[PDB]
Point group: C2
């Protein structure tokens, strides 16, 4: 940890990192470069309460635990010179660094077939996106969502609640194909269909003509607006130009180190080891952004601290469904606690592999999620009869 | 480049690296730790001329361009401490380093279903392997090869030439599924079948009982020996224990840097960027081992030198077929020069993507391979009619 510290990106990973540096005792310079001209803010409400109620001051991140930080907002880092230890800024200035931290996140993938579209086509990543989408969302408007991931599904629910007609097109046979058990994905499709969402599976957008979208089955969908939610690409251009190892994401170890000396990376921009699968993955969760940022900062200030070691997990609020998912989506067995029903959904899934818990899902059952994450952390092998038995208290079992 | 240099592994990548360091002007200490008790040697003849003629002194690597290097042969590096800058050796000694280079290659994957086998089951990676296989290869013996990659196919040809009966089982629908155009793979299967190889596609080994192997179709194959050739796994255990980013291979950039300061890696043990596909891959070719080793050494001694930048290519000698393959296995078009026939095989394949050459194959046509690799290097977009026209001289076109 050499002063001064420069962080590129001012999202959740960056804020969490700089707050931890200060909390851990580092008092040297910290400068954060953020290309969006916005007080740092959290993204999950953009698909939900913000989309619905429109108050950005309710979604700002608290920078109080990060005192004495200069935030250069509305400024883009254009390049860095890892030999000179400098960063070049879009406003003409240069910053020196002892330690450089890349926390530039990821940007939505565009749909090549809609490139020359002449109807409103947005992605949903920023406050500016959400404001723009919000302003086109009249009741009885027709919204088409492309992609079956959680963001599109979160927006789908918010739109329906407002009285918007929603169609959703996904190229695969199921929703949430990334990091969700099949049982959950099937149920989530059932729920949204019952709420009026017109689901089209195994279809792709082939193009569009004057307010209508075309599909690979040769059919059409007309809509007042398309929101594309087909995943994101790491914002790793600076790393790539400077010679760091990247592949849709900057490779880092558990200390956040890149292959370039004195340059670290964290958050959505990184490809990192998933301790459960043992494979490198770009882990794009809110918990990762915060916890990896904290872990990397902690180890920078105190090198005796361990590397980042958390197992991955996320939540997704989709209307009446409060979904929580931890670990791997499947193993050699799934245990289902409770009934899987649209009549007051509440259930828990437990994925095991050779008797060890490797994943868990709670739907409207937050009480069980915390003890399951603890059991998951230690690779617990509880009695599967007890795990199934609804009499069993998961909290107590977690001892 | 801080002295002293320690290299772990004494295979082709290591030898090529240390020879380049010396050639480039570095005169400080170099110590190489090699777990095999063998004068450093080249592996390709093990499936061919060595298997057939048995003279290991014809396959030693020339260490002459690497003067003043201490080679610790028959010694295993057990761990390294990247803070202390030391390596712990199996013989009880410790080596200090300024710069550590991991060139530990890869080891054959074992077949879990043959774990408790009670018939001879070998892999083919080392001189010791080849000697052992050689000694069980009587004419009219029955050899079963598991896996359809090039090493097994090279051995298949060598065995047939000696009068051994050969069966080969591959779990997929084709041979050489890794980095070979389908047209080549189909032809290679045709050739080996015509030479007497009993090919079984889309079958897996489920186990074995008293001299007989069992398959997932419920059938049996009896053999005097099984040689397993189902791919390799990076020897990255030391890197993993020391906290480097690894995933069946140590991630490096074009300078050979790992995520750990003063530790580099090269050769079969690395996952690196393929400039043609733009993705990270473990590139397990002879040309990579030598050329990546040379590039990393060159840049260590002279930091103004460029990073490793070669496009991947390999050859495979399979009996009457002298196969050479460069670049990607497919694009949006394949041009075929010459006829694809078992009657004196000679042909060239050219893979293009948006008019640019992205890959090439020559079978018994080495004359065309060198100009194709040059065209491939610069992303040439030659007239496809000329590329097809056999009147065309590829060498001259390469201007
Ligand atoms: C609509 C929406 C809904 C979500 N809901 C959920 C959810 O239900 N659950 C969940 O787990 N997660 C959800 N997420 C939240 C999410 O996971 C976090 O926002 C994210 O993981 C934070 O990662 P980050 O800080 O690394 O990246 P980012 O938030 O993307 O921050 C990176 C910042 O760096 C900026 N930047 C990039 N390049 C440069 C440069 N050269 N110079 C300066 N600045 C640059 C970027 O523009 C960006 O502002 C949702 C996200 C969105 C968009
Ligand atoms: C049978 C066979 C046929 C082949 N034919 C072809 C071919 O037709 N074309 C082609 O392109 N390639 C072929 N290859 C050749 C090949 O590609 C090269 O051998 C390989 O790519 C060299 O890479 P390397 O130097 O990085 O690794 P290696 O050759 O594996 O060298 C690594 C060495 O490090 C040692 N080591 C590992 N861990 C430790 C430790 N902790 N301490 C000390 N030492 C350690 C290993 O045991 C090994 O000796 C063939 C290989 C084989 C085995
Ligand atoms: N939440 C956070 O939000 C960010 C990303 O969310 P997201 O909802 O947009 O991504 P997501 O969760 O991965 O959902 C992507 C959906 O779009 C599809 N898709 C991916 N690539 C496509 C392509 N090239 N063409 C057509 N469809 C494609 C996926 O299909 P498949 O599942 O079939 O691949 C999937 O259905 C991350 O930070 C994430 O963690
Ligand atoms: N040559 C060098 O030699 C080394 C490796 O050569 P190689 O010939 O052994 O590997 P290879 O060229 O990759 O050939 C592997 C073959 O075994 C199969 N296979 C891979 N994993 C398997 C598994 N888990 N179970 C059953 N079959 C599996 C592959 O099948 P699939 O193709 O279907 O995956 C393929 O047919 C490298 O250095 C290489 O560059």
């Amino acid at each position: 940890l050499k002063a001064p510290v420069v962080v590129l990106g001012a999202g959740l990973a960056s804020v969490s990192f700089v707050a931890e540096l200060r909390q851990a005792g580092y008092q040297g310079l910290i400068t954060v470069v953020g290309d969006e001209a916005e007080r740092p803010y959290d993204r999950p409400p953009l698909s939900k309460d913000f989309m619905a109620h429109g108050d950005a001051e309710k979604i700002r991140l608290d920078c109080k635990r990060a005192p004495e930080v200069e935030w250069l907002l509305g400024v883009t880092a254009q390049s860095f010179d890892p030999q000179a230890h400098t960063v070049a800024l879009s406003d003409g200035r240069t910053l020196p660094y002892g330690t450089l931290v890349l926390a530039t996140g990821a940007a939505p993938r565009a749909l090549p077939t809609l490139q020359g579209a002449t109807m409103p086509v947005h992605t949903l990543r920023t406050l500016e996106d959400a404001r723009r989408i919000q302003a086109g969302l009249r009741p009885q408007s027709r919204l088409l969502i492309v992609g079956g991931g959680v963001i599109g599904l979160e927006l789908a629910a918010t739109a329906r609640t407002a009285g918007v007609h929603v169609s959703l097109v996904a190229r695969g046979p199921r929703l949430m194909s990334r990091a969700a058990p099949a049982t959950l994905a099937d149920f989530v499709a059932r729920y949204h269909a019952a709420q009026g969402v017109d689901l089209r599976f195994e279809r792709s957008v082939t193009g569009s003509v004057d307010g209508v979208v075309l599909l690979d089955d040769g059919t059409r969908i007309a809509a007042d607006m398309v929101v594309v939610g087909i995943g994101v690409l790491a914002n790793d251009a600076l790393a790539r130009a400077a010679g760091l190892a990247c592949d849709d994401g900057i490779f880092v170890d558990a200390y956040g180190r890149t292959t370039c000396p004195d340059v670290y990376a964290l958050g959505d921009v990184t490809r990192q080891r998933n301790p459960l699968s043992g494979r490198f993955e770009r882990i794009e969760t809110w918990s990762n952004a915060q916890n990896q940022g904290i872990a990397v900062a902690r180890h920078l200030v105190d090198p005796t601290a361990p590397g980042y070691a958390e197992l991955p997990w996320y939540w997704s609020d989709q209307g009446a469904l409060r979904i929580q998912v931890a670990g791997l989506a499947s193993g050699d067995e799934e245990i289902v606690r409770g009934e899987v029903s649209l009549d007051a959904p509440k259930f828990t899934l437990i994925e095991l592999q050779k008797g060890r818990i490797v994943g868990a899902t709670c739907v409207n059952n937050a009480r069980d999620f915390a003890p399951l994450r603890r059991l998951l952390a230690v690779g617990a092998k509880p009695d599967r009869a007890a795990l199934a038995d609804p009499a069993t208290d998961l909290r107590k079992l977690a001892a």
